[PDB]
Amino acid sequence: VRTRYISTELGIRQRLLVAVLTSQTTLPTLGVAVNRTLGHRLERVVFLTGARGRRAPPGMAVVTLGEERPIGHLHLALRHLLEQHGDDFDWFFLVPDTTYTEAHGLARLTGHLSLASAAHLYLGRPQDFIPTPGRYCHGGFGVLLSRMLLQQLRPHLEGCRNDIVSARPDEWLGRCILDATGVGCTGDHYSHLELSPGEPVQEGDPHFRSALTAHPVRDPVHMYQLHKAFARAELERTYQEIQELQWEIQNTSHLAVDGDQAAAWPVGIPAPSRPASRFEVLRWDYFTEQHAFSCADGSPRCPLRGADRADVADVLGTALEELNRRYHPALRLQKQQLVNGYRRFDPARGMEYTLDLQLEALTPQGGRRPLTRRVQLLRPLSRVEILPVPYVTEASRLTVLLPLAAAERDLAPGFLEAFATAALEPGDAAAALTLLLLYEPVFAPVKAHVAELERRFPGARVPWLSVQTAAPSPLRLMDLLSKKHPLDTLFLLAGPDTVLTPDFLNRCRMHAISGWQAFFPMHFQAFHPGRFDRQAASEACFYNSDYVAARGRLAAEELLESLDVYELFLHFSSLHVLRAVEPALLQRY
Amino acid sequence: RDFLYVGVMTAQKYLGSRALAAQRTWARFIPGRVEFFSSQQPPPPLPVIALPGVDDSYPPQKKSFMMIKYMHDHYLDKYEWFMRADDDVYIKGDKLEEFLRSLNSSKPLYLGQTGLLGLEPGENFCMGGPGMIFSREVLRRMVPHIGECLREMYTTHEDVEVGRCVRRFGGTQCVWSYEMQQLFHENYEHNRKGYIQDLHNSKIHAAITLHPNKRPAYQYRLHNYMLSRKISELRYRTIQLHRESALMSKLSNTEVSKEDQQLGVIQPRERNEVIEWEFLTGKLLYSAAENQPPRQSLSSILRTALDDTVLQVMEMINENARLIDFKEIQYGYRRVNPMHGVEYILDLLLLYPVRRHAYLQQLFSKPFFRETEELDVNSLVESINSHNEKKVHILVPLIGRYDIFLRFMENFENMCLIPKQNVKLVIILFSRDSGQDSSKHIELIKGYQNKYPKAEMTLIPMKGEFSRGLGLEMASAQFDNDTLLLFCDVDLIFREDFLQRCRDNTIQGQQVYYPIIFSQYDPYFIFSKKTGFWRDYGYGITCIYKSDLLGAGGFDTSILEDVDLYNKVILSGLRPFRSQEVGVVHIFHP
Ligand SMILES: O=c1ccn([C@@H]2O[C@H](COP(=O)(O)OP(=O)(O)O)[C@@H](O)[C@H]2O)c(=O)[nH]1
Ligand SMILES: *[C@@H]1O[C@H](CO)[C@@H](O)[C@H](O)[C@H]1NC(C)=O
Ligand SMILES: *[C@@H]1O[C@H](CO)[C@@H](O)[C@H](O)[C@H]1NC(C)=O
Ligand SMILES: *[C@@H]1O[C@H](CO)[C@@H](O)[C@H](O)[C@H]1NC(C)=O
Ligand SMILES: [Mn+2]
Ligand SMILES: [Mn+2]
C-alpha cells in the first residue's frame, strides 16, 4: 500500500497548538491584541474564555468554556484541549492573555525538541512549591505541555480538581502533573522575560533578543509595543543571517562553474542579465536632481514628477546615509549633489542605480574638501505575492454604451458592424448596446441599421434614446444613462471611434470588478489616412454603482461641465483605476 | 547539535574531488557532525576515516556495512538519526532537520526513496543514491547482525543488501509513500549526464536530497544557488517583519519610522501621474512609453523573468494540496513602480483546463549599496588637514567640410585648450584627390599647434576612399591597449561633462560607453521637442579602450559599421553602457 503523502504513512502530526486563556472582559481587548501579535505568525491558535459576552471577533477561534473561576477555567480548558484537537499536535502552549508570545522563538523552541527525547515534558519557568522537591511552571510565562503528558493527565483531571485546595491555577496544574506522572517543571533553555509594573519598552535591550514570553502585559498598547520591539530584534537577527550567508557564498564561489556570476555583487542576488542581441540590451535612464531625460511624454527632458522624484530623493538619502555610516566616525559627509544619475530595471535582478555624487568631506577637526564619489544601489526583487482580488466571472451581463453624436452618423455603421461581429454573431447574448442620440436643436439610417441588426439577429435587441438637450458633456450624458439603467449593470462606455472585438469585450468583463476596480483602456492610434495615445480616455469600463458613488462624492457645476469620466473616477473615487494598453483596440483618423 | 550525523562514503580517487566539495558545501549546514569514510591505505585533503579491510571497489558493498558498524560503535547514543550517503549527493540541512524532527526517533524508521534481485514482492529497499536515513533504534536492532548479513550476500547491489539487512533485523522496510520520490530526488529519469544543470525546476526546489552531483564545480554551483534561495527567503522575511513593525506602530498610535514605511507598504488623481501598464502576451509585449516601441518582441530577459514568476506562482498555489499544472499565459499586464516593486496581472491557463487570474506583486527588499572605488579614509583626513585624470584620445575621421572643421576646432580649443583639459586630439583626414582642402587643413592644424605648444594635436594623412572603420582602426593601431579612445565626430560640440562621463563610464575590459547622441533639428544645449531629439539608432560615438576594441575584433572594413562593432562588443562579453548624453549635441547638417 502506497500513499500520496508522508503524513498518513508516518503518522505525522501538526507541530504546535497555542491555547490562549482569556476571560469575558479580557477577550475583546487583550485577546484581540494577542491574536494580532501572534496568530498571523503561527498555524493554529485557540482562545479559551469562560463566557462569551459579545459576539466572537472575526477570524478568532473563540471557545466558550462555562466557568470563570481560574482553577475550573484551567480544568475545562484542559478538558477541551484533550477532547478536541488532542492527538493532532505534538506540543501544546497554554498562555494567558496577559503574556506576550514571541511566536518565532516559540516555533524555534518547539522545533528544537525531538519526540523521542522530550516525550513527557512540562516546560516553563520553575517555581518552588508551597515538602516535595519538585517545582511547577509559572502560569504567566506560558506552559509547553507534551501530547503524551496530556494523555496521561486525562484520567486524573477530575481527581485533581476535587481533592487539592491550591489557590493559583498554575500551582494546581503543577500539583496534578506531579501527582499523576511525577515529572516537575523542566527549565530547559526557556528564555523568559519579566517586566516591572509601569515599565517603558526600551527597544534594543539585550533581553529582547532571547525571549519567548513577556509577563505581565496589562494593556493592548503595551503588547503592541513589545511585539514591535521583538520584531526589531528578529530583523537584526535576520540581517546577521543574511550577512553570514553572503560570506559563505563568497567563500565557496570561486570553485563553482559560475565563478564571477556567483560572486557578483550583491552576493546572493541573481546576476545581471546578459543581453543576447543588440535589441535586448538594457538602457540606463539618465536623470539629474531636477529633470528626467527619459520621458514617456516624448520630450527630451521633463522635470521629475511624483514617483520618479520620490525615488530619486530616497536613493540619494540612502546613499548619503550608507556613506556616512561607512566613513563614521573618521569622516562625515555633507550636502550631496547628483552630478550623474542612472537607473534601469533588470527584470531578473531588480532596479539598479549608478550615481555620481559630488559630496563634501568634513574632518572632525573641521577641515573642508570637496569629494567626488560614484556609488551603486540595487533594490532586489523579493518573492512574488498574490494579492487578494474579488472573484470575477467570465460571463457577465455587459451593456456597451455609445453617445452617438450628430457628426458621427457616417461612422456609426462601422461601429455597429464591429459590435455585431464581436457579440451578436456569437450565440451567447453576452453584450447589449444602448446607444444614445444627441438631437441637437434626421437619423433614419441609424435606426434602419439597428432594425436590420434586430431582424438578422432576433435575439439581439438594441435600444436608443433621443437626448434633445445640448452640451454633450461626458458626465452629463453619463448621469442620464445611469439614471435610465439598473444600478448593477456592467457599463462599457465606448466612443464612436471604437472597433470592439470579442477579446476586448472579455477583457472588459473580467477586468471591471464591481465596486473594486474600473478599467480604462488606451487604444492603438495610427497616423495617415502607429501609437498608443495616453492622454485620451474614450473607452471606459466601470459599473453603474461605482459611477453613482463618484457622482455623489462630486456633489458633496464647472467640474460637471469640464470633467471627464476618467478624471471623475480619478478624483472622486477610491477605486483602482487600471490604465493599460489594449492591442485589440485599433483607432485611426 | 547532536540531532543528525551523516556519514558520507567516498573513495581514494574522490577525496580531493567530491569529498572536499561535499565538506565545503553541505557539511557546514547539517545539524550535527559529518564524517567522511574511505578505504584503508598502506596528506589527504580531508579528515577521513579508513575502515580496516575495505577496498575501493564499486559497488561499495560492505563499505556501507563497515561505516554503519562504525556509526553504531562510536555515536549510537550521541545522535538520534544516522544518514548513509554517497559523495555525489546534495543534502539540505534545514529541510531535512525539520522533516526528521517531525518524527519519533525511538521508533524503528528506515527512511529513503523507495526502490523498485531476490525481492519476494511486498518488500523493498531504500535506494542508495538520494540517501538513506536510519534511526537510533534501527541501528541498535540491526548492527549486531551486520556480520550475519555480510555472510548471506545475495545480490551485487549494496543498497539492496542494506535494505534486506534492515528488514531481517530492524523490523522496518523503506517508506512506500510517493512523496519520497519528491523529497529524496533521484534526478536520473532526466539529466542523463550526471550533474545538476536545470536549477529552476520545482523538483529541485521541493527536494531535500539531490543526486547525482558527480561534477564538483556543479556541486558548488548548486550550493551557491541554494544559498541564494535562502538569502531570498530571508529578504522576504525582512519585508514581512517591516510590514509587521509598521502595522504594529500604527496600532500603538505612534509614528512609524522611515525604514518601516517604505518597505511596509501593503488614487493618483492627477492625469499624468497614473502609471500605465504594458500588455504581455505569450511572446509579444506592447508598451505605451514613447521610448519603447509598441509590439516589440518579448525579450529573453522578460521571458525568463515571466517564467520564474509563473514558477513561483505555481509553487505558492500548489501549497494547499489538487496538483495544479501550468500551460501558457493568454495575456498579461505589468507595471514597474520604481521605488516599490512590480505588479503583474497574469491570465494563466492552469490544469487541475481552467483559466485563473493572479494579481501578482513583487516588492523590493532593502536596497544594497557599494562604492565603485573605495578610498583610504585614514590617508584622506590628513590630506584635508594639510586636470590629471585619464587621457582621452579624440579620433575624428574627416572628408572635406572646411567650415564644420573650423567650427569644431574653435569649440574644441575654447573648451579644452585654454582650460588645459587633459585630452589628445587626433585628426583623421582623408586626402580626397590628394590635395585640395588638405593643405588648408594642415595650415590650420599647424597654426593651432604652435599657438598652444603643450597641446597634443596630430593629423594622419589618410588616403583612399571614405571609410570610417578603416581610418579609425589604423588611428587606433598606433596606440597601446591601455589607452582611452573616443570615436568623436566632426559635427559635434561637447563640454567637460561629456569627457568626465566618458572617463567614468568606460571600464577597461568590462564596460563600453555608447551614448545616445542628441541630434539638433534643422533650424545649443537647450533640450526641447523642437530643438532636437535623442538618436537612439546612432551608435557612431564610442568611448572604448584599445584592448576592448581589439578583443571585439575591430571594424570589418568591408561594408552600419558602428552597429557591427556594437554587436561584436556584446558578443565579446563587454557591457555596453547605453544611456542619454546631455553633454554633447550633434549639429544639424544636410
Ligand atoms: O570504485 C569505487 C567507486 C565508487 N565508490 C563510492 O561508492 C559510492 C557509490 O558511487 P556513486 O555514487 O558514484 O555511484 P552511483 O550512485 O552514481 O551509481 C560513492 O560514495 C563513491 O565515492 C567507491 O568507494 N569505490
Ligand atoms: C485574528 O487574526 C486573524 C489572522 O491572524 C485575522 O484574520 C483576524 O482578522 C484577527 N481578528 C481580529 C479581531 O483582529
Ligand atoms: C516514540 O516511540 C516510543 C516507542 O515506540 C514511545 O515509547 C514514545 O512514547 C514515542 N514518543 C512519543 C513522543 O510519542
Ligand atoms: C592588449 O590587450 C588585449 C586585451 O584583450 C589583448 O587582446 C592584446 O593582445 C594586447 N596587445 C598587446 C600588444 O599586448
Ligand atoms: Mn551517486
Ligand atoms: Mn553627422
Residue numbers in the entry:
A (entry chain A): 104 to 233, 237 to 294, 299 to 551, 562 to 649, 667 to 693, 699 to 731
B (entry chain B): 170 to 211, 218 to 291, 300 to 449, 456 to 510, 515 to 545, 556 to 589, 616 to 752, 765 to 800, ...
Show sentences the authors wrote.
The CHSY3-CHPF complex was selected for structural and functional studies due to its highest thermal stability and in vitro chain polymerization activity in our setup. An octasaccharide, (GalNAc-GlcA), representing both an acceptor substrate for the GalNAc-T reaction and the product of the GlcA-T reaction, was added to the sample, along with the donor substrate analog/reaction product UDP, prior to EM grid preparation. Cryo-EM analysis provided a 3D reconstruction at an estimated nominal resolution of 3.0 Å, revealing the overall architecture of the CS polymerase complex with its four GT domains. Predicted C-terminal α-helices of both proteins were not visible in the cryo-EM map, probably due to a high conformational flexibility. The analysis revealed that CHSY3 and CHPF form a tightly packed complex, with their respective N-terminal and C-terminal GT domains interacting strongly, resulting in a total interaction surface of 6711 Å2, as determined using PDBePISA36. Additionally, EM densities corresponding to three N-glycans were identified at asparagine residues N279 and N710 in CHSY3, and N138 in CHPF, with a fourth potential site at N361 in CHPF. Furthermore, EM density was observed for a UDP molecule and an Mn2+ ion in the active site of the N-terminal GT domain of CHSY3, as well as for an Mn2+ ion in the C-terminal GT domain of CHSY3. No EM density was observed for the octasaccharide substrate that was added during sample preparation. The active site architecture highlights key residues involved in catalyzing CS chain elongation. These include a DxD motif (D261 and D263), commonly found in GT-A fold enzymes, which, together with H394, coordinates the Mn2+ ion. Additional residues contributing to donor substrate binding in CHSY3 are D231 and K238, located near the uracil moiety; D262, which interacts with the ribose group; and R187, Y233, and K397, which stabilize the pyrophosphate group.
